[PDB]
Amino acid sequence: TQPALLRLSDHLLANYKKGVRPVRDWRKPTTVSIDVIMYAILNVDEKNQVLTTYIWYRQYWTDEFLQWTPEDFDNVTKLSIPTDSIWVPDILINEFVDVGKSPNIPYVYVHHRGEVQNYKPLQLVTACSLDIYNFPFDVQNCSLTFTSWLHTIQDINITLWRSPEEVRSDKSIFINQGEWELLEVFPQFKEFSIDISNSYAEMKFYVIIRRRPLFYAVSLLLPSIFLMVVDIVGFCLPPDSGERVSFKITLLLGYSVFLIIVSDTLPATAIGTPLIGVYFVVCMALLVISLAETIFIVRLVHKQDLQRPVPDWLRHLVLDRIAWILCLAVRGLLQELSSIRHFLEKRDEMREVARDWLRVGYVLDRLLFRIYLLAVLAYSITLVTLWSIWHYS
Amino acid sequence: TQPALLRLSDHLLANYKKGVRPVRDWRKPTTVSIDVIMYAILNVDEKNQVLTTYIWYRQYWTDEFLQWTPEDFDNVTKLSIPTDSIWVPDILINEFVDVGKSPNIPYVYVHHRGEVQNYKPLQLVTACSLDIYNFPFDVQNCSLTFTSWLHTIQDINITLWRSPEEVRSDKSIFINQGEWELLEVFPQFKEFSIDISNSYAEMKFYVIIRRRPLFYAVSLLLPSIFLMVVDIVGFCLPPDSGERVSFKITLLLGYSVFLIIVSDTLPATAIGTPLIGVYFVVCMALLVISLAETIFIVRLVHKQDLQRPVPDWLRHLVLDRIAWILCLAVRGLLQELSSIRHFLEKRDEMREVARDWLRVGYVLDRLLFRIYLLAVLAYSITLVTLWSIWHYS
Amino acid sequence: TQPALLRLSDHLLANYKKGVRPVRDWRKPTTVSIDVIMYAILNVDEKNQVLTTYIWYRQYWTDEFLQWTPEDFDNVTKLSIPTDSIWVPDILINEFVDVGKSPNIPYVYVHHRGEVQNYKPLQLVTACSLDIYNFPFDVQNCSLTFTSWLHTIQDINITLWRSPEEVRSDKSIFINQGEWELLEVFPQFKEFSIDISNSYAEMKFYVIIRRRPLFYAVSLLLPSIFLMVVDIVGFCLPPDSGERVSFKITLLLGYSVFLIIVSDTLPATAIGTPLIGVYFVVCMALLVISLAETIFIVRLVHKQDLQRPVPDWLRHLVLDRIAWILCLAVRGLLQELSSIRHFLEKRDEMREVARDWLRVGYVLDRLLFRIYLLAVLAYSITLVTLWSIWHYS
Amino acid sequence: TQPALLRLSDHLLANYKKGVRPVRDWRKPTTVSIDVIMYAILNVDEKNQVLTTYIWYRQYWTDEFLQWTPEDFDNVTKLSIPTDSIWVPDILINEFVDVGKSPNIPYVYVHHRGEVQNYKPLQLVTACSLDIYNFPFDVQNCSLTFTSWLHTIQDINITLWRSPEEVRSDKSIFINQGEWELLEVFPQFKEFSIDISNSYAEMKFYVIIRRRPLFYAVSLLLPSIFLMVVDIVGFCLPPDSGERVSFKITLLLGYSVFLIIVSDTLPATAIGTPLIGVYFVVCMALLVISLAETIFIVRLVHKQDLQRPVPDWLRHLVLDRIAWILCLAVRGLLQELSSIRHFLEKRDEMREVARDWLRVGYVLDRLLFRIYLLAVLAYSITLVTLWSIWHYS
Amino acid sequence: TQPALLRLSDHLLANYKKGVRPVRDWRKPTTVSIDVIMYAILNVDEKNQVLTTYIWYRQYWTDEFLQWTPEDFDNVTKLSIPTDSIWVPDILINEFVDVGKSPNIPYVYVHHRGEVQNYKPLQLVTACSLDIYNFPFDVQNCSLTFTSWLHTIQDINITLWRSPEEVRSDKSIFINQGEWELLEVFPQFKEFSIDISNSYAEMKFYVIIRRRPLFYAVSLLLPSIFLMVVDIVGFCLPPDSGERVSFKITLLLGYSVFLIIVSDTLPATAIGTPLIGVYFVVCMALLVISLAETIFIVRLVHKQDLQRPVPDWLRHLVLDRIAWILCLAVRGLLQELSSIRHFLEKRDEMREVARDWLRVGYVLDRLLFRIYLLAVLAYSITLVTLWSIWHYS
Ligand SMILES: *[C@@H]1O[C@H](CO)[C@@H](O[C@@H]2O[C@H](CO)[C@@H](O)[C@H](O)[C@H]2NC(C)=O)[C@H](O)[C@H]1NC(C)=O
Ligand SMILES: *[C@@H]1O[C@H](CO)[C@@H](O[C@@H]2O[C@H](CO)[C@@H](O)[C@H](O)[C@H]2NC(C)=O)[C@H](O)[C@H]1NC(C)=O
Ligand SMILES: Cc1nc[nH]c1CN1CCc2c(c3ccccc3n2C)C1=O
Secondary structure (H helix, E strand, O other): OOOOOOHHHHHHOOOOOOOOOOOOOOOOOEEEEEEEEEEEEEEEEOOOOEEEEEEEEEEEEEOOOOOOOOOOOOOOOEEEEEHHHOOOOOEEEOOEOOOOOOOOOOEEEEEOOOEEEEEEEEEEEEEOOOOOOOOOOOEEEEEEEEEEOOOOOOOEEEEEOOOHHHHHOOOOOOOOOOOEEEEEEEEEEEEEOOOOOOOEEEEEEEEEEEEOOOHHHHHHHHHHHHHHHHHHHHHHOOHHHOOHHHHHHHHHHHHHHHHHHHHHHOOOEOOEOOHHHHHHHHHHHHHHHHHHHHHHHHOOOOOOOOOOOOHHHHHHHHHOOOOOOOOOOOHHHHHHHHHHHHHHHHHHHHHHHHHHHHHHHHHHHHHHHHHHHHHHHHHHHHHHHHHHHHHOO | OOOOOOHHHHHHOOOOOOOOOOOOOOOOOEEEEEEEEEEEEEEEEOOOOEEEEEEEEEEEEEOOOOOOOOOOOOOOOEEEEEHHHOOOOOEEEOOEOOOOOOOOOOEEEEEOOOEEEEEEEEEEEEEOOOOOOOOOOOEEEEEEEEEEOOOOOOOEEEEEOOOHHHHHOOOOOOOOOOOEEEEEEEEEEEEEOOOOOOOEEEEEEEEEEEEOOOHHHHHHHHHHHHHHHHHHHHHHOOHHHOOHHHHHHHHHHHHHHHHHHHHHHOOOEOOEOOHHHHHHHHHHHHHHHHHHHHHHHHOOOOOOOOOOOOHHHHHHHHHOOOOOOOOOOOHHHHHHHHHHHHHHHHHHHHHHHHHHHHHHHHHHHHHHHHHHHHHHHHHHHHHHHHHHHHHOO | OOOOOOHHHHHHOOOOOOOOOOOOOOOOOEEEEEEEEEEEEEEEEOOOOEEEEEEEEEEEEEOOOOOOOOOOOOOOOEEEEEHHHOOOOOEEEOOEOOOOOOOOOOEEEEEOOOEEEEEEEEEEEEEOOOOOOOOOOOEEEEEEEEEEOOOOOOOEEEEEOOOHHHHHOOOOOOOOOOOEEEEEEEEEEEEEOOOOOOOEEEEEEEEEEEEOOOHHHHHHHHHHHHHHHHHHHHHHOOHHHOOHHHHHHHHHHHHHHHHHHHHHHOOOEOOEOOHHHHHHHHHHHHHHHHHHHHHHHHOOOOOOOOOOOOHHHHHHHHHOOOOOOOOOOOHHHHHHHHHHHHHHHHHHHHHHHHHHHHHHHHHHHHHHHHHHHHHHHHHHHHHHHHHHHHHOO | OOOOOOHHHHHHOOOOOOOOOOOOOOOOOEEEEEEEEEEEEEEEEOOOOEEEEEEEEEEEEEOOOOOOOOOOOOOOOEEEEEHHHOOOOOEEEOOEOOOOOOOOOOEEEEEOOOEEEEEEEEEEEEEOOOOOOOOOOOEEEEEEEEEEOOOOOOOEEEEEOOOHHHHHOOOOOOOOOOOEEEEEEEEEEEEEOOOOOOOEEEEEEEEEEEEOOOHHHHHHHHHHHHHHHHHHHHHHOOHHHOOHHHHHHHHHHHHHHHHHHHHHHOOOEOOEOOHHHHHHHHHHHHHHHHHHHHHHHHOOOOOOOOOOOOHHHHHHHHHOOOOOOOOOOOHHHHHHHHHHHHHHHHHHHHHHHHHHHHHHHHHHHHHHHHHHHHHHHHHHHHHHHHHHHHHOO | OOOOOOHHHHHHOOOOOOOOOOOOOOOOOEEEEEEEEEEEEEEEEOOOOEEEEEEEEEEEEEOOOOOOOOOOOOOOOEEEEEHHHOOOOOEEEOOEOOOOOOOOOOEEEEEOOOEEEEEEEEEEEEEOOOOOOOOOOOEEEEEEEEEEOOOOOOOEEEEEOOOHHHHHOOOOOOOOOOOEEEEEEEEEEEEEOOOOOOOEEEEEEEEEEEEOOOHHHHHHHHHHHHHHHHHHHHHHOOHHHOOHHHHHHHHHHHHHHHHHHHHHHOOOEOOEOOHHHHHHHHHHHHHHHHHHHHHHHHOOOOOOOOOOOOHHHHHHHHHOOOOOOOOOOOHHHHHHHHHHHHHHHHHHHHHHHHHHHHHHHHHHHHHHHHHHHHHHHHHHHHHHHHHHHHHOO
16 A cells, blocks of 8 residues: 555554664664754853853764665655654763753654754753953853763764864854853863773863953943042142042042942952952052052141251252252330230241241152152053053964 | 544544654645734843743644545534644744743644644743944844754745735734834745755744833933032032032042942943943043142142242233233330331231232132033033934934 | 442543533534632732732533433532543633743532533733832732633633622732732623634733832831931031031932932833922922022132122111111331231221121021021922822722 | 562552542542641741741541452552552642742552552742731741642541641751741641632641841841940030031931941831831931031030120029039320220130130030930930840740 | 564563562562762852752662573673663652752663662752851851651661762862862761651761852951051041041941941851951951040140149159150320230230140150050951961861
């Protein structure tokens, strides 16, 4: 009879047992040939050391029992069979820490020599070690290891579909504009063993990704450069005005409020902070020097029952530092008038010695303003020198 | 016998095999005709580049084996059959990154020529690229690509149910008032291929949505306009009062606290900030100019052992800038009295030279108050000019 | 034989096909009678427009094939049958956006005329439109629409179990004390159609709920009334003390910190803020008037090389505003003494003209203190007048 | 033959129907005997009124069809059978609002008289009413009601395994150190009915738990006591120094910042705040009195063109309050000298009347410092008196 | 016939019953030998007392019914069988509070004597008690107890695969760099019993882990050391400048803002705060002493109608504390001139007595500056002494 070509499928699955590993001779292994394309990097968790990706996967193997001649079946050379009717190998990942939700694919291809092809997408929640020592300019190297979980090397061996050079140079479908950049995917065959007499075939894929360091660079420099500019403008306040101290402590208050927002959005691993955490406490201690310079000079020019300064410490300040660096009734009358002259004289002499301290506090202020402005320019061009040698190639 | 019309269903499913693709001739493909109505936009994730929608889906195909004449079955022309008793094609989406939870529909229709109709709702968690360069006034363009995952173009081809003009103009059931606005849904047929000799039918639906920019506009201008008004009122403080500097640094402190709440609720992609991030740092640097204008003028009118100002720099300030822009016992007595006259004279001459600097600091203050008020009005009407040319049509 | 009364169930399920819609004549529809009691309002999401409830559901229909006479089965009139052995209709909701987790009920009742009764609880995650224009005093109106997803009006029709007046007045089991208050549940029959020749039976239940506006009212007035009381106490500071300006800007700083916590806990839809967002910016601008009143009067009473004020602007201030509203050696001596008289005279005349400005700044201060206190009392009793007409009935 | 004792299980399950309620006579109900041990309190959600626990559950019933004599089966008196091969009753909870994830137990015991024993653990997500009127010192009373969802009182009745005194005094395995303390679990039998002619057996377990109020007490008093101590130290500043007002408004600013962190971590139900919310606004208004005492006394001792105070209001302040509570050329000369005497006399008389107001502002300051220190000590020992009568027994 | 070696599997599973515990004699128990390797510590929840790990698990037992001679089956000594075709024991954990998501392994090994080997990975969500008394330097000790949930000691007994010394010293695959450090895994056999006549075999594994205390130590000392350095610099302000009080209250404000971020990220159990919570309130009260030292000395050097100080309290301050520790018309003229001498004399004598109080306030200031600097150095080297004795071994 010739009803249709559903007479192939019941010829092929009349007495078929889906629990038996499909070989005629039990001494020969089943060889599974796999292949991978990366599709998206969904999440990189630096705190929990967990990577979440999404790949497209395919594999084939040889089934000794699903064979037919294409004649006597109207030249059919392949057909589709449900997945839960045949033997399927158990290929897992060593680095699993969870189970991702993936769509179910209910069909496979079967060619007329026994080659069974399986296509399925996979969401992977794996665990890889993440070092963040140079935090925005970092390249990560995480691994995917496909292996058979039960069967040993004498039952299931794993090979590649195609050559490892075609797998390495494949970035055709990768979803970009998403904060991570795929560089390469490199395969490598190894053989796993913990104890003796049990070896397991495995196939490591190394996934190398790189962070796009643009929006971390503007969301961490644009407040850092800004609060340095406001500190430079605050030196132009005169120190005997009672406002420079209140300026510097408010701005130092507003800067410490900023760092606790930075640590809220930027994590750190068990080795500690990255290298840019050093460059924040250098800009922190550079404001405490400007605070200690203000408190040192407000103590200087202030009116406390003063004496005339040291003639040694006036001579090499006023003269040298501006040249090397900068540019019965009758006689009862005048006895009372001499007393009135005396109270005005002590008022004037305490006033002119307050001027001599005030002249010292202004030559020494423009001296320390130019030393501070020299240090914040030498450190600023150092920070852009190290960046510009990175950016080339 | 005539028991009921359950004698149709066992005639139709006596020897039926749900794993075989239902054709008499294996050389002809099965053609699936699909159709879509968008129901809700559930979530748009700008950070992770993930779109979450909810659609209503339907499809039909032709089954060669489910055919009957309507006579000898009491004129039955269609009936309902459980879904897990027949062959169902595997239509997926390329852009899946997750599996949404959808209700199960356990029945299908079957007409008497073999047409099998399937209705089901779907929740879709897809991945599309989102550019936010003009952040509240942005139109997104994300894609849905329906394809068969295993079968090639020689087995399953995908067509539309109805015309592509009826699909494009369908906004009948879309749930509004929910922060996104559906513009159109446009279908397009393509043919997918990565390697040679394997082509897959696909059907792209382009979903174009647009953000409603109302409550982002009031939750970002109403604090931005407000802290500009408070800065204008603070110029009316007199500069030799010791409070204008403390006014400006508190208000600049409270403005920098505001931006870190803005970045907490407004994300940015890998290309960086949107265009309105430029318009925040222009309003930022416009407050530092008002801070540097205060510190420049407090340094001017302040009492430090002063000299009389330059007659050149007084003449074109006091005169020109207000006209072009603005509107033995006896002889021992008087020798002591001349000394008492001398201490009061140095007290008065240091007082009148502090007035001459104070007159300079007030002509120059109302000059810089009108230049600053001219710039904050020219920039404010520029910002509403660019908005009003957008709003028309 | 008479073994037991398991001989009923195998008589009833010997040749039973659970895929066939159970009618003798295929032209007559199956009528499903439903009923609902609301149990809890779990979540109302104003941002995503999503409602989450939990109901108790029941339904019955007529099965033509499950019929027996109660004699010859020892007078059994009903029995329980597993759910997955019989035909069950597919009743869904139009407003689904998710799938809730509900317990499984594995049994149904079957009476001896064919009536099959089904009881099950359901968790529903639906989508309804939420307007929050009057934010704590708001009544919402969301919908639940039970319909058959595949079968049309010629196969499945939906009716009510009991009368629509018994469904409307049922609040027996509703879990209270949980921030929402159930008012009524009102049913209504409609008939759904998008295209021609396909009509679907549906049954809308309108669920009307009302927010309990107690703890939103104390967590939004008790800081709003408090920072108005502190502003009233701050007018009693004297204006020529240098502390009133620093008082008002700190309190205005602490008030703007408060609103960004309010917007963090209170959402807004696409139409913008509710009506109480207007009543916050009225209390905002009422503090800027008190700030501008302080800066206007500190500029007035301050010692800058002053002149005597206008006699017109002193006469209607000092006199009128307090009445209509408030309540050779010898001749060389005295030439020097006349100079000493002259320096003390210019010191005294600049002191008495600073008193005349100081008298103006205190009559005008108590005038503007009573105008401000009149406005904050007229607006406060207006705000309680609008509340008291709401509270009655 | 005697192969093994798998000949018992096929004798026992040859013709067994798992859909039939297992009685010989259909008029007799099946009696289910249950038992509970509480294992952990996982979550108590005060906002959503949801309790999450984890119990260990067991139950037995009598199966008329699973009976054998132990002879002719090698003295087997019990054996284990898979769960999905026999009839299982449907015991649910009325208070479900979700479905918890519990491990599956695939086996049951069967004794030779028909007693079928079932052991399983359960995670329960229920809804109970939570009153938090005394927030850390609160005892909650939530309920668990086990009932049959479909079958009425004529089919399934629920009893206890063991006595209700053994269930009440069982705290053997409860995981402690986890913020809630289990007091007792008390069972009670009732009979549920909404309409007539349908009654359902139920079994309420009352679960009484109590919060451990230790770390809420130190995380709410240690900032509350601290900002009261800082306010006491700030009275020792002299009031005519211009810093006491700036002290009090900064500290009142920092206290209002603290309460918005308290409301972020401590929820409130629909009845409003707990009783300790009253004790925060008493400590709030106790700082406004210290603020209004400062502003009242800075207005007093301040130099505005003053007059001598009232002799009545000086006599009962300076004298009484310290005793009852505290402890041609020649004649042209002296006409000019009398003028110079006159300008120094008006300078001195305006200075001594500023001392007389300054003496009033210091007797009245130490008076109001001791009244304020008496109120903050009488309220502090009241707050520890109410705590110490609670702590005993 | 000799078709293949699928003739072994149908010989082995022709009449096999997967519900029967596989023994020939029912009096002998089934012995299960287990083994564990820890792979990752996923989460340690200190608030909810919940541990989340991920292990690799394996077990074997003896099946009396799956036996064959390897001859007459072409020398096959083992083969793989699906898991859902044979009897599997029910090994659970006592400490479950949830169900983790683990991958499914669908195959087992079967040797020719009946030994059935099972390999599977497991995610475990257990509940262990966590004491955090020494918060970063803490070692936890949580438990895993494998037991059979239904069967007693006469049915299932649990043993180890390999020796307990090989299990204890196994850290081969543990994923490091993830904030917790695995020390050892120690097994122990016990026997569980609540009531009489029912004993259950169990096998406790003790898991000892240790926190890596590096990044908690820098994120809690680097702001704590920093705000102590800023307080030392603030003593160099002169006390009669009106800025030291405003310095100390701003810095004390900014320190109390810091602790509420610390408690947000660091939890505490029911016993209260850890030991480092004591070391924060010691650094808290060390700033209130510096605040009370400032307010005590501003009250001292301030100009209120002063008297000369006590000669006893000047002698042991000025002299001792610097030595032991530190280093008709005519007669009408002069009657008026004596009055002018009198007003200048009272002006001078009130000025020199303000100097004598000012000298006292500076000897006493450098005295209390060196006592405070001695206490903050003795406590700082104590804090590093206790750390250095911990770090050695
Ligand atoms: C809730 O909303 C519905 C809107 O559908 C209101 O529905 C109307 O109800 C009346 C009868 O009460 C009908 O005549 C109208 O045809 C309904 N409208 C529509 C569009 O069908 C309902 O009244 C609302 N409930 C409350 C309490 O306001
Ligand atoms: C917990 O709440 C229940 C409320 O149902 C209390 O229940 C009452 O218990 C007494 C006996 O103790 C019965 O006589 C009452 O009929 C019960 N009330 C109701 C409404 O049924 C129970 O006592 C409470 N437990 C505690 C410790 O307070
Ligand atoms: C909502 C409902 N209520 C009962 N049944 C249905 C299903 N409903 C029926 C009509 C319908 C659907 C559909 C889907 C895609 C394109 C066009 C479509 N049309 C015209 C389909 O979802």
